[PDB]
Amino acid sequence: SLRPLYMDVQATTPLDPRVLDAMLPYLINYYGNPHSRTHAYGWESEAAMERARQQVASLIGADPREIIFTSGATESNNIAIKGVARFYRSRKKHLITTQTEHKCVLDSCRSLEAEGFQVTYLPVQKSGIIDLKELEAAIQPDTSLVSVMTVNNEIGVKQPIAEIGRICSSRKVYFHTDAAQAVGKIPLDVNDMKIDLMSISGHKIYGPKGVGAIYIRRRPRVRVEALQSGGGQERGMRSGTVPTPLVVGLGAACEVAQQEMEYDHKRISKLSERLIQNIMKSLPDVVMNGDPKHHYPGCINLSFAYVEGESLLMALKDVALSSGSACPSYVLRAIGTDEDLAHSSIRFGIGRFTTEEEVDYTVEKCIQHVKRLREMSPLWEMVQDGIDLKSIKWT
Amino acid sequence: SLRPLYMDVQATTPLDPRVLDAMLPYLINYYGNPHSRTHAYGWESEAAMERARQQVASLIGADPREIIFTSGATESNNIAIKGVARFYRSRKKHLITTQTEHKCVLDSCRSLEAEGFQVTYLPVQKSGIIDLKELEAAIQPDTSLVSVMTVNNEIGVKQPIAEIGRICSSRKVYFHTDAAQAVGKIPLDVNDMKIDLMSISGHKIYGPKGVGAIYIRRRPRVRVEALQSGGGQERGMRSGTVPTPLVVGLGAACEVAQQEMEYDHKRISKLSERLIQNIMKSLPDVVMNGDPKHHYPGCINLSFAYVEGESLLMALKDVALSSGSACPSYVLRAIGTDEDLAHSSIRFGIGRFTTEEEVDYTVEKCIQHVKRLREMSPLWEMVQDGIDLKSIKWT
Amino acid sequence: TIEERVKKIIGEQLGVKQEEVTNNASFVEDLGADSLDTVELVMALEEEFDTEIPDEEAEKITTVQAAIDYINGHQ
Amino acid sequence: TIEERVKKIIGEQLGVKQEEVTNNASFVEDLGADSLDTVELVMALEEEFDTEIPDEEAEKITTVQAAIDYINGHQ
Amino acid sequence: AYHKKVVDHYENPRNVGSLDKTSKNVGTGLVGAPACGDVMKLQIQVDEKGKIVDARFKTFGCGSAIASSSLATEWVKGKTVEEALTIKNTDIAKELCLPPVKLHCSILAEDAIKAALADYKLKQEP
Amino acid sequence: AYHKKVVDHYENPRNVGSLDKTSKNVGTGLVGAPACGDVMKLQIQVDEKGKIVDARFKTFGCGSAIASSSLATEWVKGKTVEEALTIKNTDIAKELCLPPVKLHCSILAEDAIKAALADYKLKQEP
Amino acid sequence: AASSRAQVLALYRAMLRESKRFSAYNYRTYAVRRIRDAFRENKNVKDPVEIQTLVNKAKRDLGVIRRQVHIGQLYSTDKLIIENR
Amino acid sequence: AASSRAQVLALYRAMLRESKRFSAYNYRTYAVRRIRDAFRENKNVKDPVEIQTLVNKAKRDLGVIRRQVHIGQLYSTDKLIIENR
Ligand SMILES: *P(=O)(O)OCC(C)(C)[C@@H](O)C(=O)NCCC(=O)NCCSC(=O)CCCCCCCCCCC
Ligand SMILES: *P(=O)(O)OCC(C)(C)[C@@H](O)C(=O)NCCC(=O)NCCSC(=O)CCCCCCCCCCC
Ligand SMILES: O=C(O)CN(CCN(CC(=O)O)CC(=O)O)CC(=O)O
Ligand SMILES: O=C(O)CN(CCN(CC(=O)O)CC(=O)O)CC(=O)O
Ligand SMILES: *Cc1c(COP(=O)(O)O)cnc(C)c1O
Ligand SMILES: *Cc1c(COP(=O)(O)O)cnc(C)c1O
């Protein structure tokens, strides 16, 4: 039967055809191991790997020697957080992060707390943004690392990465950012932002799944204890066979994004404004989660009061969306969303290939089915009869 | 210009066209995240992931619930060795492995020795095979894990996996095998061999790079502490996004190998005998490294006395081969090879797509260039004049 | 809805009121088209009338009536 | 090396000495071919003489002389 | 959300609505909590012989909650009050083929039946 | 192994061979060790005016070792013994574009020149 | 010397015609829109070297479109809900 | 009812003809050899259900060969040294 519209780009993206085109030769005749040093299959694969490394470096303003390939931003987040913590553990035992980070950062930090490290999970404002002055105050003499993500995967809000870099640089604390939802989307420059480590995911930027990278600053030198033991590939930081076709795809996705970022941001901004404005002018009690003043337009998280989010996703049977989603939501809890409204939130994703027709269809169906589910809702019935839900003794 | 013959399958394999055909739909229109639970892109990707899990399980005799997808056998080896050691560290601090294991097993064990664990690196016989009675003697009351690889990546020799399983099962010690060079090549059955953990690499079996699996026995339950923190994918054992196209390719490669194993083994055995016999009948002082009675025929490691191996690889300019290679060799040292002969060894790989014409060309060029390099060699000149090299005071 | 669906296509493509799409009008000189627009306009006529317009014929379709005449002469 | 390169192809394909590849011989009845062999033999004649042999002609090429005759009649 | 049997109760709604809470022959059950993501209102209408002759529901909750409460509402019709008391969460789950992570939906729907029946019974004591 | 300049000394060999070790005008240098993977034999022939008029080499070693020793053998011809003493490992490496992991090859080739020259000088003392 | 305008208008027609053959809605609609927007954006470039660079990039992208249209036809799937109504 | 022998001999010719179009030496030589060996190996199967299964597998593999031959032509490379001499 006919397929649903894809409006779920923060979970993953389709491959850009330019990226699959760049990868295919390595899946067909250039199948050598990039670490085979004694023959042309190895030489050509190594050369493709190094070209891709330069493409990743160029997008973020790095030197290629600072780019380490990984299997995804999950692995990159583990290397940055556990790798820095373990390296400086003789002198430093404290790390700082936020309450709205992706699960791999939070669970890496939890694992370190079981290893005897101290972790401060900073709260965020209701905007979703951290308080820079609270970050400054939390830094201790034995703080080794601050980790704050560039763009949030559930609500799309942008942390003040350059200002955090200023704070960390000035105190000689390493600064990591999980940039998986920001890379090729908003400008990133590791020197202007004073970043020491950065996580990158290929499948969030029209590249293939199974690949990512970690930027590790070389001047001033950032030290990381490697997590994956082996023969010393990737400068000893990530042993194992570098998967040439996937890293070719990651580099191609980075080069395409470097060229298309401004065009996409203009187009996605317009579609995002259209979606939010046309839903809000047609439905009462719709709230955007996250501050629109510091927000990436392709990730739109709205609450529809009196309707539960999973039932709305079921109702929108021909649109692929997500709810309380990591790429009862802990991110919505952290920004102070009422628990019932957090059960009423949906995430809409707009990306490089989204059309105005898809946005308009999604808007029209959302308006129709929010009204339908409200007509089925006992909470809407009670408020329509003037009952204050905050006065009921539930269960 | 014209391309060299690929005779280096232990470093990596080309993709089987059947495997690339199975992967392509997931690189073009089935690009959903297998963890997206609320829409058809996710459902179809999840279903493809679970079908691939069953294909891997069927090849090794496992239940699909015992298959965890990883980025490669390097990661699988780290999970098995560090994961078991860390889980049982309250009661057990000793692990056993061998001196000829791949670098990821050896370096994982070295990292654990720095964590305060005790590791016995068993020696092997001159055949390359371990002494089963020496293994039995090395097991201590606090031994948590034995790790011994099924097929060696440099010399191709087969360890007595079923007999090691008997030993470990009877002592309630977990048994891991790195099967990266054995899976889809020789029969593997986890219950008949009494295996508790097994590492699998997709790119050694005509599958894509960047993917692997680890078998973790569920009855009796084997416990492993996870290494990659995150949202709990793969039953909490390997967090991160499962890369649907790559795991589809791994499952397809396993199903194709299950169907082609007997045909390939017969064909590769014949080509391997041809290569070894025709080189040895035409050149003096050629020695096979590893016992031919316990050996996988597709991996042939020979020494050519009086010629250095890298110069022979350079001379064989149109054949892709490798020397002192991990998929002065520590494996050759461990089997007692004289250091000079270990500098004289080459690895030839014969796989599913190798032709008799390629074997004959390689043999003919090897004979020609060993003779040429011997005519350039001062060591050959000295032996031809009756000098005993073992009587010279070198440097 | 005669074959002066041609006029509807020209007006839509060039952002010109149906009133100003006169039979004598040149796309470039009279309706403000550039040559990117006229490539697109020819393709839009190919699409609407399920017809192929090769380069030597496309080069002659420079006015409303030339478009009308071509489509009438090709079923 | 006349067009009785046809005999060389038949002998090679069917493992039969050139002496036993007589003009009157049927591939199946006289030279021990099965129908997998005769598919391959027809393709080998197509390859050697750069000629296409479609199914209704291939079905009639069942003897050495029928092969010889077909190739002589197709340049 | 996915199961055809569950989605049917949303795409083809039946008995959605309200009954008169002031009636001595209406029982109203309101169970769950907005903060838990599932609130079910189930109302039953009982004739003077004790037979349930009609029922209505409204639910805030996932598709499986809507289907569980919708199915409960269909199932109580034509049953006596004592009969309806024997509808089990496990029958609702079986009918809808609920996976284990959604079994709490069939439990809440059974709680809604019993709260409606209890409310009706309270009203009959005079 | 890869560099065109290195491979040339194997594909197009020159001066491979031996000179008469018993000659008072031949110096023989044998340096390196089989266990280290690199053994170079370099022989020089010197005329009665002290000019090196011919040279030969044999080498067991990787392509860069063969090229380094082959180039040394070409370079000593036409040089006086004192001139040949000033050939440096760094000139050999530069000519062949050796990467750092192969610089030890140019060092051994310089050692071979000096061992051959030293052997010749020893022979002239009577 | 080749005519930059003739290359440009020939490439524009060819790229749009080939992009319309993408089986997948999201690649087809993106490629057609992107081509229209890029040629219009670059209409007033005057430097002949820069024009030549843009033409060479377009020729490269036409090869990509041709191959990826073919691959997408070999592995096609159902249409999207909105391609009906 | 379809003739199993006619399907089999038609598929054998078609699979061999298509496999000979593989641009890459190692896929071409493997596919031709494997097809010859598999049909010969299965020559004496007598169970009509098992024959039908094998025929269906061959039809599936002919689709794979067709697509992978085309993909390998779109992304072809130089020949191997031994394809010269
Ligand atoms: P007409 O009005 O007579 O003339 C129009 C032109 C453009 C020819 C005229 O204005 C002119 O000559 N301008 C000079 C500058 C110029 O030539 N600009 C065009 C250069 S080519 C170009 O810009 C191509 C950009 C390629 C975009 C491809 C995007 C593909 C995406 C595919 C993804 C899968
Ligand atoms: P002829 O002698 O009249 O008849 C020959 C046949 C085989 C038709 C005759 O013997 C017969 O009818 N036998 C009955 C059994 C039978 O039909 N066997 C054949 C079944 S089909 C088969 O075996 C196909 C196997 C497919 C192999 C494909 C390998 C592809 C690899 C590609 C990789 C990229
Ligand atoms: O040019 C475009 O933007 C896309 N399409 C039209 C896209 N269609 C979908 C379809 O034709 O099935 C739009 C739609 O129906 O929504 C051109 C073409 O069909 O060749
Ligand atoms: O059928 C086969 O086994 C392969 N080839 C022949 C393989 N050739 C290589 C070539 O034709 O370039 C063999 C060779 O030259 O080594 C058939 C074909 O060319 O269509
Ligand atoms: C997707 C994502 C990740 C994980 O990336 P993978 O490449 O899937 O491992 C990490 N952080 C954020 C913010 C993400 O959106
Ligand atoms: C190749 C190989 C590995 C590593 O596998 P990857 O999938 O490349 O990480 C491990 N063990 C052996 C024996 C190998 O040959």
Short mmCIF file of N, CA, C and O in Angstrom, two decimals, chain A residues 237-310:
data_model
loop_
_atom_site.label_atom_id
_atom_site.label_comp_id
_atom_site.label_asym_id
_atom_site.label_seq_id
_atom_site.Cartn_x
_atom_site.Cartn_y
_atom_site.Cartn_z
N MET A 237 43.50 5.72 18.92
CA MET A 237 42.29 6.15 19.59
C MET A 237 41.06 5.32 19.26
O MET A 237 40.08 5.38 20.00
N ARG A 238 41.09 4.55 18.17
CA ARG A 238 39.90 3.75 17.86
C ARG A 238 40.38 2.58 17.01
O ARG A 238 40.35 2.59 15.78
N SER A 239 40.86 1.52 17.68
CA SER A 239 41.33 0.33 16.98
C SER A 239 40.17 -0.40 16.31
O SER A 239 39.02 -0.27 16.71
N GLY A 240 40.53 -1.10 15.25
CA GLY A 240 39.55 -1.82 14.42
C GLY A 240 39.70 -1.40 12.98
O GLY A 240 40.34 -0.43 12.72
N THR A 241 39.04 -2.10 12.09
CA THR A 241 39.16 -1.78 10.66
C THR A 241 38.31 -0.56 10.32
O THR A 241 37.15 -0.63 10.54
N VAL A 242 38.92 0.47 9.77
CA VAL A 242 38.13 1.65 9.36
C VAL A 242 37.27 1.22 8.17
O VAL A 242 37.81 0.75 7.21
N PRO A 243 35.95 1.37 8.26
CA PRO A 243 35.09 0.89 7.20
C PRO A 243 35.04 1.90 6.04
O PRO A 243 34.24 2.71 6.04
N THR A 244 35.93 1.71 5.07
CA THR A 244 36.11 2.66 3.94
C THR A 244 34.80 3.13 3.32
O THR A 244 34.61 4.30 3.22
N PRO A 245 33.85 2.28 2.91
CA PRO A 245 32.68 2.82 2.28
C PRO A 245 31.88 3.75 3.19
O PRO A 245 31.31 4.66 2.72
N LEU A 246 31.86 3.43 4.48
CA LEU A 246 31.02 4.25 5.39
C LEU A 246 31.71 5.58 5.63
O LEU A 246 31.04 6.62 5.73
N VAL A 247 33.06 5.58 5.81
CA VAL A 247 33.72 6.84 6.05
C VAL A 247 33.72 7.68 4.78
O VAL A 247 33.60 8.91 4.86
N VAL A 248 33.85 7.07 3.60
CA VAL A 248 33.63 7.82 2.35
C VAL A 248 32.26 8.50 2.36
O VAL A 248 32.11 9.67 1.98
N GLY A 249 31.22 7.74 2.75
CA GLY A 249 29.88 8.34 2.82
C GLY A 249 29.81 9.48 3.84
O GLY A 249 29.17 10.50 3.56
N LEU A 250 30.45 9.31 5.00
CA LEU A 250 30.45 10.41 5.99
C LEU A 250 31.15 11.63 5.44
O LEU A 250 30.65 12.76 5.58
N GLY A 251 32.30 11.45 4.79
CA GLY A 251 32.99 12.64 4.26
C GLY A 251 32.15 13.28 3.17
O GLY A 251 32.07 14.51 3.10
N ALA A 252 31.55 12.46 2.28
CA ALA A 252 30.70 13.04 1.24
C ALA A 252 29.50 13.78 1.82
O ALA A 252 29.15 14.87 1.35
N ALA A 253 28.93 13.23 2.88
CA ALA A 253 27.79 13.92 3.50
C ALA A 253 28.23 15.25 4.11
O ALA A 253 27.48 16.24 4.06
N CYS A 254 29.45 15.28 4.69
CA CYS A 254 29.95 16.53 5.26
C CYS A 254 30.20 17.56 4.16
O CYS A 254 29.92 18.75 4.34
N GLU A 255 30.81 17.13 3.03
CA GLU A 255 31.07 18.10 1.95
C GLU A 255 29.76 18.61 1.36
O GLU A 255 29.63 19.80 1.08
N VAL A 256 28.78 17.71 1.15
CA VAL A 256 27.50 18.18 0.62
C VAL A 256 26.86 19.14 1.61
O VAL A 256 26.39 20.21 1.21
N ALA A 257 26.90 18.82 2.90
CA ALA A 257 26.30 19.72 3.90
C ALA A 257 27.01 21.05 3.97
O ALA A 257 26.36 22.08 4.11
N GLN A 258 28.34 21.05 3.82
CA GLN A 258 29.03 22.33 3.82
C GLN A 258 28.51 23.23 2.69
O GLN A 258 28.32 24.44 2.87
N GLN A 259 28.21 22.62 1.55
CA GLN A 259 27.71 23.37 0.37
C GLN A 259 26.23 23.73 0.48
O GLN A 259 25.85 24.73 -0.06
N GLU A 260 25.45 22.92 1.17
CA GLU A 260 23.98 23.09 1.17
C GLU A 260 23.46 23.70 2.47
O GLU A 260 22.31 23.99 2.50
N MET A 261 24.32 23.93 3.44
CA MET A 261 23.79 24.35 4.76
C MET A 261 22.94 25.62 4.68
O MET A 261 21.88 25.71 5.32
N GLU A 262 23.45 26.68 3.98
CA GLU A 262 22.72 27.96 3.97
C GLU A 262 21.39 27.81 3.23
O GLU A 262 20.35 28.32 3.68
N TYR A 263 21.42 27.10 2.08
CA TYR A 263 20.19 26.89 1.33
C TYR A 263 19.15 26.09 2.14
O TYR A 263 17.97 26.49 2.20
N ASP A 264 19.62 25.05 2.83
CA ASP A 264 18.70 24.24 3.61
C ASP A 264 18.16 25.04 4.78
O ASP A 264 16.98 24.91 5.14
N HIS A 265 19.02 25.84 5.40
CA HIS A 265 18.50 26.53 6.58
C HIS A 265 17.44 27.53 6.18
O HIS A 265 16.41 27.66 6.86
N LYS A 266 17.62 28.19 5.05
CA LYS A 266 16.59 29.15 4.61
C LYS A 266 15.29 28.40 4.30
O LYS A 266 14.18 28.84 4.69
N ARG A 267 15.40 27.27 3.60
CA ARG A 267 14.20 26.54 3.17
C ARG A 267 13.48 25.91 4.36
O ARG A 267 12.24 25.96 4.47
N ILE A 268 14.24 25.27 5.24
CA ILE A 268 13.67 24.61 6.42
C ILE A 268 13.09 25.64 7.40
O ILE A 268 12.02 25.41 7.97
N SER A 269 13.75 26.80 7.55
CA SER A 269 13.14 27.88 8.36
C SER A 269 11.76 28.25 7.87
O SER A 269 10.83 28.41 8.67
N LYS A 270 11.61 28.42 6.56
CA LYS A 270 10.31 28.82 6.04
C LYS A 270 9.26 27.73 6.26
O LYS A 270 8.11 28.03 6.62
N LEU A 271 9.62 26.47 6.01
CA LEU A 271 8.66 25.37 6.20
C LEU A 271 8.31 25.23 7.67
O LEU A 271 7.17 24.89 8.02
N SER A 272 9.29 25.42 8.55
CA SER A 272 9.07 25.28 10.00
C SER A 272 8.11 26.36 10.51
O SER A 272 7.14 26.07 11.25
N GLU A 273 8.36 27.64 10.12
CA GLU A 273 7.42 28.70 10.47
C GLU A 273 6.00 28.38 9.97
O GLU A 273 5.00 28.61 10.69
N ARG A 274 5.88 27.89 8.73
CA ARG A 274 4.59 27.52 8.16
C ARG A 274 3.89 26.46 9.00
O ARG A 274 2.70 26.58 9.29
N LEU A 275 4.61 25.39 9.37
CA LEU A 275 4.02 24.32 10.15
C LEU A 275 3.53 24.83 11.50
O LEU A 275 2.37 24.55 11.91
N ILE A 276 4.40 25.55 12.23
CA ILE A 276 4.05 25.98 13.58
C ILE A 276 2.90 26.99 13.51
O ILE A 276 1.91 26.89 14.24
N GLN A 277 3.01 27.95 12.61
CA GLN A 277 1.97 28.99 12.56
C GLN A 277 0.61 28.42 12.13
O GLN A 277 -0.46 28.84 12.66
N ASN A 278 0.61 27.49 11.17
CA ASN A 278 -0.67 27.04 10.67
C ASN A 278 -1.32 26.07 11.66
O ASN A 278 -2.54 26.04 11.76
N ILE A 279 -0.53 25.36 12.44
CA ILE A 279 -1.17 24.51 13.47
C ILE A 279 -1.71 25.42 14.58
O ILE A 279 -2.83 25.25 14.99
N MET A 280 -0.91 26.37 15.02
CA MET A 280 -1.34 27.20 16.16
C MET A 280 -2.51 28.11 15.83
O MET A 280 -3.26 28.39 16.72
N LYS A 281 -2.65 28.53 14.59
CA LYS A 281 -3.81 29.41 14.31
C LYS A 281 -5.09 28.58 14.19
O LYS A 281 -6.14 29.17 14.22
N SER A 282 -5.00 27.26 14.11
CA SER A 282 -6.16 26.44 13.89
C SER A 282 -6.57 25.60 15.09
O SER A 282 -7.68 25.04 15.07
N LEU A 283 -5.74 25.52 16.13
CA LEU A 283 -6.03 24.70 17.31
C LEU A 283 -5.72 25.50 18.57
O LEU A 283 -4.61 26.03 18.68
N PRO A 284 -6.59 25.49 19.56
CA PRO A 284 -6.26 26.10 20.84
C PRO A 284 -5.39 25.17 21.66
O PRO A 284 -5.31 23.98 21.41
N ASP A 285 -4.75 25.75 22.66
CA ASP A 285 -3.97 24.95 23.64
C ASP A 285 -2.87 24.10 23.00
O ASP A 285 -2.66 22.95 23.40
N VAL A 286 -2.13 24.68 22.06
CA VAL A 286 -0.92 24.07 21.47
C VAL A 286 0.26 24.90 21.96
O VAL A 286 0.23 26.16 21.86
N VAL A 287 1.26 24.23 22.55
CA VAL A 287 2.42 24.94 23.12
C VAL A 287 3.69 24.38 22.49
O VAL A 287 3.82 23.17 22.30
N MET A 288 4.61 25.28 22.10
CA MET A 288 5.92 24.81 21.63
C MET A 288 6.84 24.56 22.82
O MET A 288 6.97 25.41 23.72
N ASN A 289 7.51 23.41 22.83
CA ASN A 289 8.49 23.09 23.89
C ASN A 289 9.86 23.56 23.41
O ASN A 289 10.35 23.07 22.39
N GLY A 290 10.45 24.50 24.17
CA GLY A 290 11.76 25.05 23.82
C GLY A 290 11.62 26.48 23.28
O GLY A 290 10.62 26.86 22.65
N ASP A 291 12.65 27.28 23.53
CA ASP A 291 12.60 28.71 23.16
C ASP A 291 12.81 28.90 21.66
O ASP A 291 13.92 28.63 21.16
N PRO A 292 11.85 29.49 20.92
CA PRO A 292 12.03 29.70 19.50
C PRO A 292 13.16 30.67 19.14
O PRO A 292 13.52 30.69 18.04
N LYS A 293 13.67 31.41 20.10
CA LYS A 293 14.76 32.38 19.82
C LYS A 293 16.11 31.67 19.73
O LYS A 293 17.01 32.28 19.25
N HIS A 294 16.24 30.46 20.26
CA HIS A 294 17.52 29.70 20.27
C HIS A 294 17.17 28.27 19.86
O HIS A 294 17.23 27.41 20.65
N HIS A 295 16.85 28.13 18.60
CA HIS A 295 16.22 26.87 18.18
C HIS A 295 16.55 26.56 16.73
O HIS A 295 16.54 27.43 15.93
N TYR A 296 16.84 25.30 16.47
CA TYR A 296 17.07 24.83 15.09
C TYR A 296 15.69 24.52 14.48
O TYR A 296 15.04 23.69 14.97
N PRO A 297 15.29 25.18 13.38
CA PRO A 297 13.94 25.07 12.87
C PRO A 297 13.46 23.70 12.38
O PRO A 297 12.33 23.50 12.32
N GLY A 298 14.38 22.81 12.09
CA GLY A 298 14.01 21.49 11.59
C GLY A 298 13.48 20.54 12.65
O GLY A 298 13.01 19.53 12.26
N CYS A 299 13.58 20.88 13.93
CA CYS A 299 13.08 20.02 15.02
C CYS A 299 12.00 20.78 15.77
O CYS A 299 12.36 21.62 16.43
N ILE A 300 10.75 20.38 15.67
CA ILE A 300 9.62 21.15 16.24
C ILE A 300 8.89 20.23 17.20
O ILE A 300 8.35 19.21 16.78
N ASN A 301 8.88 20.58 18.50
CA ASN A 301 8.23 19.74 19.50
C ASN A 301 7.05 20.53 20.05
O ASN A 301 7.25 21.59 20.65
N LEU A 302 5.83 20.02 19.80
CA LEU A 302 4.63 20.71 20.27
C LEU A 302 3.84 19.80 21.20
O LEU A 302 3.76 18.59 20.97
N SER A 303 3.17 20.43 22.19
CA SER A 303 2.19 19.72 23.01
C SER A 303 0.78 20.11 22.60
O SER A 303 0.51 21.26 22.31
N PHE A 304 -0.11 19.12 22.57
CA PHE A 304 -1.54 19.29 22.22
C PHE A 304 -2.34 18.94 23.47
O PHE A 304 -2.52 17.80 23.74
N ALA A 305 -2.79 19.94 24.21
CA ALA A 305 -3.36 19.58 25.49
C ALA A 305 -4.61 18.73 25.29
O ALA A 305 -5.34 18.90 24.32
N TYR A 306 -4.83 17.83 26.23
CA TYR A 306 -6.04 16.98 26.35
C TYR A 306 -6.02 15.77 25.42
O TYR A 306 -6.99 15.08 25.42
N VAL A 307 -4.93 15.57 24.68
CA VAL A 307 -4.76 14.44 23.77
C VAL A 307 -3.47 13.74 24.15
O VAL A 307 -2.45 14.43 24.31
N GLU A 308 -3.47 12.43 24.24
CA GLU A 308 -2.20 11.74 24.52
C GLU A 308 -1.40 11.54 23.25
O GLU A 308 -1.93 11.24 22.19
N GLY A 309 -0.09 11.74 23.36
CA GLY A 309 0.73 11.80 22.14
C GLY A 309 0.74 10.53 21.28
O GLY A 309 0.70 10.62 20.05
N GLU A 310 0.84 9.35 21.89
CA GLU A 310 0.86 8.11 21.13
C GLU A 310 -0.43 7.92 20.35
O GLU A 310 -0.41 7.43 19.21
#
